[PDB]
Enzyme design. Structure first.
Site, PDB file in Angstrom:
ATOM      1  N   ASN A 125       0.882  -1.168   0.000  1.00 45.95           N
ATOM      2  CA  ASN A 125       0.000   0.000   0.000  1.00 45.95           C
ATOM      3  C   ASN A 125       0.913   1.209   0.000  1.00 45.95           C
ATOM      4  O   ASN A 125       1.489   1.568   1.026  1.00 45.95           O
ATOM      5  CB  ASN A 125      -0.901  -0.017   1.237  1.00 45.95           C
ATOM      6  CG  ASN A 125      -1.919   1.127   1.274  1.00 45.95           C
ATOM      7  OD1 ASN A 125      -2.024   1.949   0.358  1.00 45.95           O
ATOM      8  ND2 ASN A 125      -2.678   1.173   2.362  1.00 45.95           N
ATOM      9  N   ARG A 141      -2.295  -2.092  -3.816  1.00 50.58           N
ATOM     10  CA  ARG A 141      -3.553  -1.377  -3.552  1.00 50.58           C
ATOM     11  C   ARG A 141      -3.564  -0.117  -4.400  1.00 50.58           C
ATOM     12  O   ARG A 141      -2.692   0.741  -4.258  1.00 50.58           O
ATOM     13  CB  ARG A 141      -3.669  -1.002  -2.065  1.00 50.58           C
ATOM     14  CG  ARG A 141      -5.070  -0.601  -1.569  1.00 50.58           C
ATOM     15  CD  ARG A 141      -5.312   0.902  -1.588  1.00 50.58           C
ATOM     16  NE  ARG A 141      -6.557   1.285  -0.921  1.00 50.58           N
ATOM     17  CZ  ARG A 141      -6.656   1.659   0.353  1.00 50.58           C
ATOM     18  NH1 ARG A 141      -5.578   1.714   1.120  1.00 50.58           N
ATOM     19  NH2 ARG A 141      -7.839   1.992   0.865  1.00 50.58           N
ATOM     20  N   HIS A 171     -12.914   2.037  -0.180  1.00 53.68           N
ATOM     21  CA  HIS A 171     -12.838   0.929   0.788  1.00 53.68           C
ATOM     22  C   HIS A 171     -13.567  -0.323   0.308  1.00 53.68           C
ATOM     23  O   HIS A 171     -14.134  -1.064   1.127  1.00 53.68           O
ATOM     24  CB  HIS A 171     -13.427   1.323   2.152  1.00 53.68           C
ATOM     25  CG  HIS A 171     -12.662   2.373   2.868  1.00 53.68           C
ATOM     26  ND1 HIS A 171     -13.277   3.478   3.423  1.00 53.68           N
ATOM     27  CD2 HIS A 171     -11.343   2.486   3.149  1.00 53.68           C
ATOM     28  CE1 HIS A 171     -12.372   4.228   4.010  1.00 53.68           C
ATOM     29  NE2 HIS A 171     -11.193   3.654   3.859  1.00 53.68           N
ATOM     30  N   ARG A 230     -10.656  14.740   6.671  1.00 56.14           N
ATOM     31  CA  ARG A 230     -11.540  15.031   5.516  1.00 56.14           C
ATOM     32  C   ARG A 230     -12.905  15.497   5.985  1.00 56.14           C
ATOM     33  O   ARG A 230     -13.425  14.983   6.976  1.00 56.14           O
ATOM     34  CB  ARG A 230     -11.696  13.780   4.637  1.00 56.14           C
ATOM     35  CG  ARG A 230     -10.423  13.448   3.870  1.00 56.14           C
ATOM     36  CD  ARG A 230     -10.510  12.250   2.948  1.00 56.14           C
ATOM     37  NE  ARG A 230      -9.599  11.252   3.462  1.00 56.14           N
ATOM     38  CZ  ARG A 230      -9.626   9.940   3.247  1.00 56.14           C
ATOM     39  NH1 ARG A 230     -10.547   9.369   2.503  1.00 56.14           N
ATOM     40  NH2 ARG A 230      -8.694   9.188   3.831  1.00 56.14           N
ATOM     41  N   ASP A 258      -6.361  11.618  15.640  1.00 62.63           N
ATOM     42  CA  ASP A 258      -6.438  10.308  16.275  1.00 62.63           C
ATOM     43  C   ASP A 258      -7.539  10.257  17.318  1.00 62.63           C
ATOM     44  O   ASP A 258      -7.554  11.059  18.234  1.00 62.63           O
ATOM     45  CB  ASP A 258      -5.081   9.994  16.933  1.00 62.63           C
ATOM     46  CG  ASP A 258      -5.000   8.568  17.418  1.00 62.63           C
ATOM     47  OD1 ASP A 258      -5.488   8.285  18.513  1.00 62.63           O
ATOM     48  OD2 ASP A 258      -4.488   7.719  16.665  1.00 62.63           O
ATOM     49  N   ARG A 298      -8.166   8.274  19.830  1.00 67.56           N
ATOM     50  CA  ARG A 298      -7.770   8.056  21.233  1.00 67.56           C
ATOM     51  C   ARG A 298      -7.388   9.391  21.862  1.00 67.56           C
ATOM     52  O   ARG A 298      -7.785   9.703  22.976  1.00 67.56           O
ATOM     53  CB  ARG A 298      -6.614   7.057  21.319  1.00 67.56           C
ATOM     54  CG  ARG A 298      -7.017   5.676  20.859  1.00 67.56           C
ATOM     55  CD  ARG A 298      -5.811   4.815  20.592  1.00 67.56           C
ATOM     56  NE  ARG A 298      -5.162   5.233  19.356  1.00 67.56           N
ATOM     57  CZ  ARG A 298      -4.330   4.478  18.656  1.00 67.56           C
ATOM     58  NH1 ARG A 298      -4.032   3.245  19.054  1.00 67.56           N
ATOM     59  NH2 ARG A 298      -3.805   4.954  17.538  1.00 67.56           N
ATOM     60  N   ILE A 350     -11.306   2.610  14.288  1.00 65.90           N
ATOM     61  CA  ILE A 350     -12.304   3.146  15.187  1.00 65.90           C
ATOM     62  C   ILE A 350     -13.452   2.160  15.421  1.00 65.90           C
ATOM     63  O   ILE A 350     -13.886   1.946  16.570  1.00 65.90           O
ATOM     64  CB  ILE A 350     -12.849   4.490  14.642  1.00 65.90           C
ATOM     65  CG1 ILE A 350     -11.715   5.460  14.469  1.00 65.90           C
ATOM     66  CG2 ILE A 350     -13.907   5.051  15.560  1.00 65.90           C
ATOM     67  CD1 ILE A 350     -12.088   6.684  13.641  1.00 65.90           C
ATOM     68  N   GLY A 351     -13.990   1.603  14.338  1.00 66.94           N
ATOM     69  CA  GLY A 351     -15.163   0.741  14.448  1.00 66.94           C
ATOM     70  C   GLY A 351     -14.890  -0.502  15.280  1.00 66.94           C
ATOM     71  O   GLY A 351     -15.760  -0.974  16.033  1.00 66.94           O
ATOM     72  N   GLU A 363      -7.907  -6.223   4.972  1.00 61.85           N
ATOM     73  CA  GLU A 363      -7.825  -5.869   3.570  1.00 61.85           C
ATOM     74  C   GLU A 363      -6.642  -6.578   2.862  1.00 61.85           C
ATOM     75  O   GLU A 363      -6.744  -6.976   1.706  1.00 61.85           O
ATOM     76  CB  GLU A 363      -7.685  -4.364   3.459  1.00 61.85           C
ATOM     77  CG  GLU A 363      -8.981  -3.663   3.848  1.00 61.85           C
ATOM     78  CD  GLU A 363      -8.730  -2.246   4.297  1.00 61.85           C
ATOM     79  OE1 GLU A 363      -8.313  -2.099   5.466  1.00 61.85           O
ATOM     80  OE2 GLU A 363      -8.965  -1.318   3.483  1.00 61.85           O
TER      81      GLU A 363
HETATM   82 MN   LIG Z   1      -7.245  -0.090   6.430  1.00 62.22          MN
END
Ligand SMILES: [Mn+2]
Ligand SMILES: [Mn+2]
Lengths: 381, 381
Positions: free
Chosen positions: B10, B74, B163, B224, B265, B267, B314-315, B367
């Site tokens: 990537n 990628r 994604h 973004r 970030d 956190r 995050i998810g 991924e």
């Molecule tokens: Mn990723």
């Protein structure tokens, strides 16, 4: 009679709409439009208002004999400066001119309307009502875009929202139709006209709305794109020989339903679809898909939704739009009744099935009446 | 062993990520990142890949002794030209260069990665996997923006979506976790990482997704904006002394959570919120409000939804995000269980309450593994 009346003016770039209306009764003594301004027999807004006086006369109205108490002016953008109905004078007008980069398309015509009207009708109070006003106190989480804070605060960039007079008026009339207090209701209003916008409202306070910094954002409209990646601007500047102003213009005037089908009027669109025009069906499906998303998004914003109301030229009349906007949403609490949803109907009315967990109405809007009542109020009652 | 392995690359503007991985087992022999490219000890991507070979060595890997069968690259944007995994040669690469106005930020680094890798590892097949591929066949009503048709078709303007590897992989793993066939499922996937995007998927076919022409559109992200009135570009060009490229850059790098709070970030964001930072709480509330809308919008797109899955950095890990994204949606069919939603957990797992009409999962994405399996497949199996 001894009835008082307000002359409500909506001054656009190439048109001027007017209605003389009784705020207590809601009857309109006269209504009309002067079109094709500065293209033709009416080169400027001074001629357009003079021409409107002719129209009022040949239609049987005499302004001195009519009980005229105020002139209401529709102004699209109040920025963060004006949100309540505002009595016009020279100082206020100077401050309005400071909003013209926020609203370069929509505001300058309203200010021409104000100058002409105050000169030709100096005997009575002039009041501005702002399409952004209802939304001035949107929650910060909904009003704030996720961009550089410094630049946003410096240039007053936020979600302003428009059709505020219609959204507020319809929310009140939906409460009245249901015979339930407004303060206890959560609702969605879909104003589908030339401009198209949706709102989510809790009691007397809106929680979100689909138009943004300007009236371009949100739903697909007659000639406006609604939502699109902002990168399209840079992309077209880099590929297609367009400047930023050419792109903005295309998004406002050559997009939406006209951009996809070549027509802007939904009745014309339905004719095209029925004759097998593939582009018209695509345009309609794009419009409908966007609309369905906003309904879903706003059910989630509200958490509990009592009522969804359709309004304006499309929302009041296009049964297919209403069917296709909420079909297949039974599991989200929405069930429409075919008989109740029939075309040609008038008046505030239920279009949902009796057992629908969420009520769906058509509630005709009357922005002129609401503006007439705002004028009357701010001038002492 | 006799195990085969793919090196997944990537390549970004200033970084190069790699993972050597066994597609059958899913184990990663080695993984790392080379950072700060061209600022520093690694001035170009030629150095970065050489430096990655060092990292692989000092970490105990020998590429000749490792069963290397392909290199996966990628590539963010395939336009309308490439959607399936594509074996790389000089002709294909020439055609990829034609996509660089669609993806001027994201694609050029991937192509530097490809040139370097094909030169330094000419013994094995190189394959490109496109982040847009899964979405190539979005329904026309969702893929088509409401803008001038002529110009859209001429410059290939549509909702592409990104994604795609994660959304597809997570949709498959959610089906596997529920032990129900993929073809019968309707689901929402929320990939909340640096980039953030949502998808609505019916069986094997996506119906909509939140990113657009580029990866800027949709959800609030680390840097973004996501959704914003495109008029912001013209507005800032007219007021703030910015060109279109300065605005685009601000929306991509100085917006989102960093634009509103000064950190990217999550956190770090939670630390700020806990210490009473008002700007951090606002940024979080803006992020959360946008996310809630997309969930609602996609429940409406699907009509019936079996499962919603959270994924990416995050998810997978931020319990507060997941709680706040679906709280107060019991009447829409979503009920979370506090014990099941605890932080620090690993593995595919149910976070909804047992009686929730809609199931909610966390499903870790992979991924690199999905790209390794795509490479293996296209090369004969
Ligand atoms: Mn990723
Ligand atoms: Mn109207």
């Amino acid at each position: 009679d001894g009835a008082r009346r307000v002359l409500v003016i909506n001054s656009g770039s190439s048109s001027l709409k007017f209605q003389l209306v009784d705020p207590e009764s809601g009857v309109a003594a006269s209504t009309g439009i002067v079109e094709r301004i500065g293209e033709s027999p009416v080169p400027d807004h001074d001629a357009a208002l003079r021409r409107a006086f002719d129209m009022l006369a040949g239609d049987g109205v005499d302004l001195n004999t009519a009980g005229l108490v105020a002139v209401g002016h529709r102004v699209v953008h109040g920025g963060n400066t004006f949100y309540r109905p505002t009595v016009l004078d020279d100082a206020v007008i100077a401050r309005l001119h400071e909003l013209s980069e926020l609203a370069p398309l929509h505001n300058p015509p309203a200010l021409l309307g104000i100058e002409v009207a105050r000169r030709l009708l100096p005997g009575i109070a002039h009041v501005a009502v702002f399409d952004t006003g209802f939304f001035h106190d949107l929650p910060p989480a909904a009003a704030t875009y996720a961009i550089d804070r410094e630049l946003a605060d410096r240039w007053q960039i936020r979600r302003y929202g428009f059709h505020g007079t219609s959204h507020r008026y319809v929310s009140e009339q939906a409460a009245a139709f249901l015979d339930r207090p407004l303060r206890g209701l959560k609702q969605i209003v879909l104003h589908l006209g030339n401009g198209c916008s949706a709102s989510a409202i809790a009691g007397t306070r809106p929680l979100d709305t689909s138009m943004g910094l300007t009236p371009l954002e949100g739903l697909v409209m007659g000639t406006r794109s609604g939502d699109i990646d902002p990168s399209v601007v840079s992309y077209l500047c880099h590929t297609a020989g367009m400047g930023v102003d050419d792109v903005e213009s295309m998004l406002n005037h050559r997009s939406g339903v006209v951009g996809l089908s070549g027509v802007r009027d939904f009745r014309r669109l339905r004719e095209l679809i029925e004759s097998g025009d593939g582009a018209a069906q695509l345009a309609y499906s794009v419009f409908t898909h966007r609309l369905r998303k906003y309904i879903g998004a706003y059910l989630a914003v509200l958490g509990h939704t009592d009522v969804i109301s359709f309004t304006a030229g499309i929302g009041e009349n296009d049964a297919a739009v209403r069917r296709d906007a909420v079909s297949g949403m039974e599991e989200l609490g929405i069930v429409l009744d075919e008989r109740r949803n029939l075309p040609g109907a008038k008046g505030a009315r239920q279009i949902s099935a009796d057992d629908s967990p969420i009520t769906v109405l058509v509630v005709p809007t009357n922005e002129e009446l609401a503006i007439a009542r705002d004028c009357v109020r701010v001038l002492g009652g």
